[PDB]
Design a protein around this nucleic acid. Structure first.
Ligand SMILES: [Mg+2]
Ligand SMILES: [Mg+2]
Ligand SMILES: [Zn+2]
Ligand SMILES: [Zn+2]
Lengths: 49, 79, 277, 1173
RNA sequence: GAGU
DNA sequence: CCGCGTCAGACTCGTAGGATTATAGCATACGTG
DNA sequence: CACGTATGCTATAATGTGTGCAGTCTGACGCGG
């Protein structure tokens, strides 16, 4: 409903196709936060699974 | 089911798991086009699922049973 | 402890002795002949001049310290290009360099979008002219009034004044209240909404269905040539080379396929006609 | 895309270069003419990517036909424009520069690490003086500052063999060359010599710094920046407004300063410039960088032409305007609408009026999808144009979709969860939302222009969440106290009061009626009043031992009105409940009774029914407000003249110079207070029973049916207080000082105030109103802190298997049973039985939830006090068990595992304060305190502040021995029995002790009079003591304001305060002395120590205030998002801390699924995936 | 400026 | 202790767009159609 | 060659800043002297 760009478009198409499926991703504003922190000169990394 | 969900919650118990169970069932009806047990009486999928649970037709464990039954027969067909 | 950048710098410059003419000449003879000390002493002794001049040129260009550094750069050019043999004093010569360098710096850095010197100087004469005009016309000057004064095109004047349009901060809040600013109103116009994006999906997919209605040969020719189901918009020779030699036959099958699509549209075009908005 | 955890560590110069895809060497943004990005500039497309998708700049490569191609002509990669927000750059600084956050933001970090005072560092940085980096000659030591002239002396003398330098270079070098390992061991050696208290803290601080620095893998060099990162273009956009204007981020201006100064420095170095100029430029560089990172931190923030300080990088993370608070923990939302609300009396409880126009837009995609299934719309474009044209078939479709689809209604401020509730929408033509009356309570909604927000749950899962968890019908009871929040109000109460209330004979006294249907018939035929006393045959159902209902016919003595209401009453309930004259207070009990016996469905129907009949009869009554309704008592003027002669007496006694001004002031005030009480009594006697005007034999006395008295008596509206001002005397007003005016207002509102009375009223009125606007911030801030500290607490387990719990007594503060045992303990698990042979033979076994049944039995047996299982005493690590919590008060049964209890607790405690700060202040007017005094007391409690003059307590059991005195200051030479070594404590002279020495003293016996510090209570009398102190001391405030909150909520927060424990003595791990770790983790370690033996860890639990407890959570995202974000991030970056995202905060920030509620199932599935690899 |  | 500094200080809604200054004048030089 | 963009040089002597505002908020909690 907010940032998730891929999610919103995919969700819209799902809604038009009936299936009320959630296809969520990551809020773009979060991405931006990290970038803002790195521009600060703090290394903030995601350690993945 | 529609107005009050109390008896449906009394069947399953955990409200949150009732949500999950009815949603997984409603998703089946929505996507798979899986047949409803109770007469729709012109009602939406979610309402159907909640009625079914109230009357004690759907269950997390029962859903798991039909999943394996049918998937296993599909594997048998493959081989 | 005074940690003011400015005060510290001004104190340090103060403690270098001011030069007389004979001293400047002696030092400078050796400075041109390369005496690292000489150049340094002349520089350091004449820093105080730089600050006097940067004091004037500040105002609204830049920070005083920023002006001081650029001014120092001008002073260094002056020490390199000073002529001791000419009877003209150093301070006189240096003044020119310092003012020059400061002004040029405040003409490239003073604007977020870097304006070339040529544009800037053009624009300035339009400005000074506008001021004389307003001095006799009581009311401010129009584009065409300034243009009439210079005997020049109004478009010229207008384009210059458009460039003088100064920037707005995206973060500056609107309505006095420190709430929502420009960023808070400003959309992403490039990023279409899921409505537009989903309409294109629907479009592209309806074209697949329409392409399958046609002959296998027509559809494949169209797909490869348009670059629709293929990757690259293959030219007539590419498509022909992969199927049927006859480059000309690709044109034949292609044009044939377009016309069969028109028939589907005249029959079932009742949906297609609504794609005109 | 999906990760498990997130780490923060120091950014190395080299690491910053890794992120960068180009070095920005120019301030040029774009070209003035072709507004395209300038070479090596801040927006360089050769560096940050293409402006247009799959197009190079000069336009050589276009479309996907050229995928990853890099244009030879312009130098631009051809890819998605997306990347311009992703790709970072960098700048090579000629001179190193300090990172201001790791310099100015205290603790110093850089100063703390070198043990170098901050001033000292600064003198070095700004080139005021040199610092010795290595004086090989022991003659000159390390880190010893030399002034300019000091450097000249040793220059000739020692020289060579001492290296001392100036600026960021010096400090970086000093940092590089310090070996952390060695100096850690050296300082540990010194810690053993004579560790004084403050010395031990600072040493242990550097010890932990050095230790954490090596654990992080961070290097001290990195405190100093040589490479400076550049944020992506789209995150500091330069966009054109329509009108040919450009608008840019402030960051671009700040970066242009840095670049220009750095590049000038490179030029000055190429030219081999004199050193004073080199210095000025280095300072210049440092200034600009400091401004870039955190503007208004070091000095004057660099300002725009607007005067206003430019917004730096840190400002985007920091505070409310910051990322976290504004864009991450809370968001703008699609499928959301808003309008004015108005009443929907016709609505049933689970419904709301939803404007057609609004609903048409909110459900847009659902309508298009159904249009394609109907075959009505060929394509999406056609569907869109069909809805624009608003065709009649579209209305049928819209009607189809919205059936069974719940929508969420919200009202601001959202103080508790019931501020958002779900309803089935009922489409209405007309632009306002219609809200159901009975839930106006929870929303605090009154229709004086109020507005509400509407949200569309999209997914099958969200729709289910709305219908099951959030539906208004399902959520009746306050989660704060176990009370029904849906209760009739206003007109409804009034109407029910009207029907039930009796009058003397009236129409058809002493009739005999067959059933309540005959009654209704008679009333509406006009042969009987509603207040007619009558005999009626009612059949009342009493529910049996099992589900079967046993009915019983009885002739009762009631009014026609009561019989008719019995028709609304369900079978199951008794007739005597309605047989009384009904008011708001009786009707809440009615509803409660119905819930407990019948259940949810019946009560919901009953509530709606009551609403319909209530309003219905309210209208029929014809009840109104005329000036005659406000009755002034005849004896006003007499009472008043007497009071005036009285005041005159004290004034004359003053002029004589006998009685002081203060004595007279007090006596005048007492005279007028007493006069006021007297006039009010007169008014109420004359009004309440003014119906001295009756019948049948002869004259008789009865209750007044005056309109205002009815409103007030029913509890529908007004009260005696209000009516005092209307008909009585207004009374004494209080100044804005708080002091009371000597002259009171003798008039009332019906009488009308004169200029002076009106003026005098204003002060108090306005004081109140200002309090609403301004103090709600402080109340709400309390709400926020509570919420943040309770966040993580969830029901994790069914049964912890603990035997622990607190012994609740019935609160007989003074004498009156303030809170009966039953009400304090209902719906709690009994930890431990109590066998007292007794009357009803009650054991009541362990782990039994106290149902109303077992509670009734307690009263018959007269149970004294009871051990009840509690959140604080739970053994569950990382949450609490259902048993230790007990009933979910909002449900009326045992709490379900998964529920986010903490959040509920904080909301429940916070909300009343926040609301009462608006209630008795928009209203709070006349004086006969309030909340403005109370909440500071409450905040001082939750924050665990030690009081100004604290009581003293005995530390250890033994025998009290008094000793010596330092000129009156009491020393105490106390000597226990087994721990024979003496313990001494100095006491102030003027502080008098209540106990008298030489005594057998238990741990924590009160010596002095004064307030107890919660820490000291914890340290001496343990957890139950401090827990119960806070619960009781807090509840005193809320109790004074008539606010019901269950102890268990405050207990939740208390537990969160007691999260941490300082270890005093080494374990088998690397705990050792003075480290403070979470009690959960050290008890789990002790389970493994029990198994393995080894050295056991001796610890001691510590109490922490709410703010610090939230900042102490291992989750740094939770900490940083809460407050203090610059500091929190320096702490975590240096520690190299990783957050694995256990808490809700953390998940919400990354937009993931909450680990609680519905999300508990999925989250435990993920957790088992993590455990098996 | 609107309801707290 | 004192004193100076830093840190916090409710939720949604609204309205309206918007500001300023000024950088000489000319000669030579470098890159693209 | 031309057009747009850039660098360049000028010689009476002149050689240490300021400028425009800020309006003082508060109760709390640490940190050098
Ligand atoms: Mg109201
Ligand atoms: Mg209102
Ligand atoms: Zn190109
Ligand atoms: Zn437990």
């Amino acid at each position: 409903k907010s940032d998730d760009v891929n999610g919103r478009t995919k969700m819209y198409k799902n809604i038009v196709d009936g299936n009320h499926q959630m296809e969520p991703g990551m809020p773009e504003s979060f991405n931006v936060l990290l970038k803002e922190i790195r521009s600060l000169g703090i290394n903030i990394e995601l350690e993945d699974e | 089911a529609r107005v009050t969900v109390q008896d449906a919650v009394e069947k399953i118990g955990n409200r949150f798991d009732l949500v999950l169970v009815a949603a997984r069932r409603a998703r089946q009806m929505q996507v798979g086009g899986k047949d409803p047990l109770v007469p729709e009486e012109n009602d939406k999928t979610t309402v159907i699922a909640l009625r079914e649970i109230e009357e004690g037709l759907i269950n997390n464990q029962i859903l798991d049973v039909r999943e394996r039954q049918e998937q296993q027969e599909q594997e048998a067909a493959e081989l | 402890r005074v940690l003011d950048a400015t005060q510290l710098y001004l104190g340090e410059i103060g403690y270098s002795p001011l030069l007389t003419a004979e001293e400047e000449v002696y030092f400078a003879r050796r400075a041109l002949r390369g005496d690292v000390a000489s150049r340094r002493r002349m520089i350091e002794s004449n820093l105080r001049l730089v600050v006097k001049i940067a004091r004037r040129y500040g105002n609204r260009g830049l920070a005083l310290l920023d002006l001081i550094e650029e001014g120092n750069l001008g002073l260094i050019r002056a020490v390199e290009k000073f002529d001791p043999e000419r009877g003209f004093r150093f301070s006189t010569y240096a003044t020119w360099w310092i003012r020059q360098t400061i002004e040029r710096a405040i003409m490239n850095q003073t604007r977020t979008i870097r304006l070339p010197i040529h544009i800037v100087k053009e624009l300035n004469v339009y400005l000074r002219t506008a001021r004389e005009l307003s001095h006799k016309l009581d009311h401010e000057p129009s584009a065409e009034e300034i243009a009439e004064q210079l005997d020049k095109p109004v478009d010229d004047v207008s384009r210059m004044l458009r460039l003088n349009e100064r920037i707005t901060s995206v973060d500056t809040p609107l309505g006095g209240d420190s709430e929502k600013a420009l960023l808070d109103i400003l959309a992403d116009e490039k990023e279409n909404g899921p409505e537009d994006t989903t309409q294109d999906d629907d479009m592209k997919q309806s074209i697949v269905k329409w392409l399958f209605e046609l002959n296998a040969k027509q559809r494949e020719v169209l797909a490869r040539r348009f670059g629709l189901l293929g990757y690259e918009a293959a030219t007539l020779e590419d498509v022909g080379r992969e199927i049927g030699l006859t480059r000309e036959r690709v044109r034949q099958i292609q044009v044939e396929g377009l016309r069969r699509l028109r028939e589907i549209l005249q029959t079932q075009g009742l949906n297609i006609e609504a794609l005109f908005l | 895309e999906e990760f498990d955890a997130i780490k923060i560590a120091l950014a190395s110069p080299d690491m910053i270069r890794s992120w960068s895809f180009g070095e920005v060497k120019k301030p040029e943004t774009i070209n003035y003419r072709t507004f395209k990005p300038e070479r090596d500039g801040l927006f360089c497309a050769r560096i940050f990517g293409p402006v247009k998708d799959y197009e190079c700049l000069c336009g050589k490569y276009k479309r996907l036909k050229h995928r990853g191609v890099i244009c030879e002509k312009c130098g631009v990669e051809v890819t998605q424009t997306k990347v311009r927000r992703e790709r970072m750059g960098h700048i090579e600084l000629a001179s190193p520069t300090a990172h201001i956050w790791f310099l100015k933001s205290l603790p110093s970090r850089i100063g703390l690490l070198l043990d170098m005072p901050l001033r000292d560092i600064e003198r070095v940085l700004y080139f005021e003086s040199y610092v010795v980096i290595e004086g090989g000659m022991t003659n000159l030591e390390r880190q010893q500052i030399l002034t300019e002239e000091q450097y000249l002396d040793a220059l000739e003398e020692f020289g060579d063999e001492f290296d001392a330098k100036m600026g960021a270079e010096a400090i970086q070098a000093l940092l590089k060359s310090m070996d952390l390992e060695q100096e850690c061991e050296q300082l540990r050696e010194e810690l053993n010599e004579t560790n004084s208290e403050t010395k031990r803290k600072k040493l242990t601080k550097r010890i932990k710094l050095l230790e954490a620095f090596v654990q992080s893998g961070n290097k001290p060099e990195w405190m100093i920046l040589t490479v400076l990162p550049v944020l992506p273009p789209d995150l500091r956009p330069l966009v054109p407004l329509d009108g040919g204007r450009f608008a840019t981020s402030d960051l671009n201006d700040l970066y242009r300063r840095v670049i220009n100064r750095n590049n000038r420095l490179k030029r000055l170095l190429d030219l081999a410039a004199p050193d004073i100029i080199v210095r000025n430029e280095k300072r210049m560089l440092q200034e600009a960088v400091d401004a870039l990172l955190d503007n208004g931190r070091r000095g004057r923030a660099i300002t725009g032409s607007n005067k206003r300080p430019l917004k730096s990088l840190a400002d985007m993370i920091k505070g409310k305007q910051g990322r976290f608070r504004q864009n991450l923990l809370g968001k703008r939302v699609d499928y959301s609408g808003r309008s004015v609300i108005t009443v929907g009396p016709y609505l049933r409880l689970h419904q709301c009026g939803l404007p057609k126009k609004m609903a048409l837009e909110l459900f847009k995609p659902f309508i298009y999808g159904k249009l394609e299934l109907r075959g009505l719309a060929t394509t999406i474009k056609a569907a869109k144009k069909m809805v624009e044209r608003e065709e009649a078939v579209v209305w049928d479709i819209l009607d189809e979709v919205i059936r069974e689809h719940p929508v969420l209604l919200n009202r601001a401020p959202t103080l508790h969860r019931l501020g958002i509730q779900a309803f089935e929408p009922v489409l209405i033509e007309g632009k306002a939302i219609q809200l159901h009356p009975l839930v106006c309570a929870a929303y605090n909604a009154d229709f004086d222009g109020d507005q509400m927000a509407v949200h569309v749950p999209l997914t099958l899962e969200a729709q289910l969440e709305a219908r099951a968890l959030m539906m208004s019908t399902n959520n009746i009871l306050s989660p704060a106290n176990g009370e029904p929040i849906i209760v009739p109000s206003q007109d409804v109460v009034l109407g029910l009061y009207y029907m039930t209330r009796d009058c003397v004979n009236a129409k058809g006294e002493g009739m005999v009626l067959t059933g309540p249907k005959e009654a209704e018939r008679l009333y509406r035929s006009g042969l009987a009043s509603l207040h007619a006393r009558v005999k009626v045959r009612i059949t009342e159902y009493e529910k049996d031992a099992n589900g079967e209902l046993v009915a019983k016919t009885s002739l009762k003595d009631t009014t026609v009105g009561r019989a008719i209401l019995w028709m609304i009453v369900p079978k199951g309930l008794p007739y005597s409940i309605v047989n009384q004259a009904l008011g708001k207070k009786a009707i809440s009990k009615m509803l409660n009774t119905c819930y407990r016996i019948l259940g949810l469905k019946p009560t919901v129907i009953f509530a709606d029914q009551i609403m319909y009949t209530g309003f219905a009869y309210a209208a029929r009554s014809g009840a109104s407000v005329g000036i005659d309704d406000m009755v002034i008592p005849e004896k006003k003027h007499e009472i008043i003249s007497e009071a005036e002669a009285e005041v005159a007496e004290i004034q004359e006694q003053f002029q004589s110079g006998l009685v002081t001004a203060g004595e007279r002031y007090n006596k005048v005030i007492d005279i007028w207070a007493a006069a006021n009480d007297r006039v009010s009594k007169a008014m109420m006697d004359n009004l309440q029973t003014e119906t001295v005007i009756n019948r049948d034999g002869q004259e008789e006395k009865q209750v007044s049916f005056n309109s205002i008295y009815m409103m007030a008596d029913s509890g529908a509206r007004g009260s005696a207080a209000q009516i005092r001002q209307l008909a009585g005397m207004r009374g004494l007003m209080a100044k804005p000082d708080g002091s009371i005016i000597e002259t009171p207002i003798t008039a009332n509102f019906r009488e009308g105030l004169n200029v002076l009375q009106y003026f005098i009223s204003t002060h108090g009125a306005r004081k109140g109103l200002a309090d609403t606007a301004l103090k709600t911030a402080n109340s709400g801030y309390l709400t926020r802190r509570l919420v943040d500290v309770a966040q993580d607490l969830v029901v994790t387990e069914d049964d912890c298997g603990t035997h622990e719990g607190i012994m609740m007594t019935p609160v007989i503060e003074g004498g009156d049973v303030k809170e009966p045992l039953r009400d304090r303990v209902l719906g709690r698990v009994t930890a431990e039985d109590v066998l007292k042979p007794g009357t009803a033979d009650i054991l009541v076994p362990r782990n039994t939830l106290l149902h109303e049944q077992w509670c009734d039995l307690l009263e018959e047996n007269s149970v004294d006090a009871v051990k009840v299982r509690s959140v604080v005493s739970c053994d569950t690590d990382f949450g609490v068990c259902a048993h230790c919590y007990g009933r979910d008060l909002a449900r009326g049964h045992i709490i379900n595992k998964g529920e986010a209890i903490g959040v509920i607790a904080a909301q429940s405690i916070g909300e009343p304060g926040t609301q009462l700060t608006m209630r008795t202040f928009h209203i709070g007017g006349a004086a006969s305190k309030d909340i403005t005094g109370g909440l500071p007391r409450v905040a001082d409690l939750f924050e665990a502040r030690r009081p100004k003059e604290p009581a003293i307590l005995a530390e250890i059991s033994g025998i009290v021995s008094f000793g010596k005195e330092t000129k009156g200051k009491r020393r105490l030479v106390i000597t226990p029995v087994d721990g024979s070594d003496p313990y001494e404590e100095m006491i102030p002279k003027w502080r008098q002790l209540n106990v008298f020495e030489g005594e057998r003293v238990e741990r924590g016996d009160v010596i002095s009079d004064g307030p107890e510090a919660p820490h000291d209570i914890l340290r001496l009398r343990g957890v139950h003591a401090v827990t119960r102190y806070i619960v009781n001391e807090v509840q005193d405030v809320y109790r004074l304001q008539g606010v019901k909150i269950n102890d268990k909520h405050i207990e939740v927060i208390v537990r969160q305060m007691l999260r941490k424990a300082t270890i005093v003595n080494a374990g088998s791990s690397d705990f050792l002395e003075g480290e403070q770790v979470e009690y959960s983790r050290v008890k789990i370690a002790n389970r493994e120590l029990e198994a393995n033996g080894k050295v056991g860890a001796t610890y001691s639990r510590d109490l922490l205030g709410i703010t610090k407890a939230s900042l102490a959570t291992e989750s740094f995202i939770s900490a940083a998002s809460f407050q203090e974000t610059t500091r929190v991030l320096t702490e975590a970056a240096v520690a190299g801390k990783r957050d694995e995202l256990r808490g809700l905060k953390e998940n919400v920030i990354v937009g993931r699924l909450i680990p609680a509620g519905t999300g508990y199932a999925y989250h435990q599935d993920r957790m088992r995936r993590r455990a098996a690899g």
